[PDB]
Amino acid sequence: LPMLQVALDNQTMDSAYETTRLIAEEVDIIEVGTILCVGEGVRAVRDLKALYPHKIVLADAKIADAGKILSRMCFEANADWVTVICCADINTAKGALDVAKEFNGDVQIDLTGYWTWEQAQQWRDAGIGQVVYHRSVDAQAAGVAWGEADITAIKRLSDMGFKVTVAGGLALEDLPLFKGIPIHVFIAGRSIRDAASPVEAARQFKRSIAELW
- What is the crossing angle of helices 43-51 and 13-23, to 10°? 30
Residue from 172, 171, 167 nearest 187 by CA: 167
Size of the site for Mg ion (CB under 5 A): 3
Residue from 116, 61, 106 nearest 86 by CA: 116
47 marked as part of a ligand binding site: no
* Under rule CB under 5 A, residue 60 binds Mg ion: yes
Nearer to ligand 5RP, 32 or 77 (CB): 32
- Which residue lies nearest ligand HMS, judged by its C-beta? 189
CB of 124 to ligand 5RP, least distance (A): 22
60 marked as part of a ligand binding site: yes
Q: Which does 89 bind (CB under 5 to 8 A by kind): a second copy, ligand 5RP, Mg ion, none?
A: a second copy
Binding-site ranges for ligand 5RP (CB under 6 A): 7, 9, 33-34, 60, 65-66, 137, 167-170, 187-191
The annotated binding site for Mg(2+) is made up of 31, 60
Q: Which residues are annotated as a binding site?
A: 9, 31, 60, 190
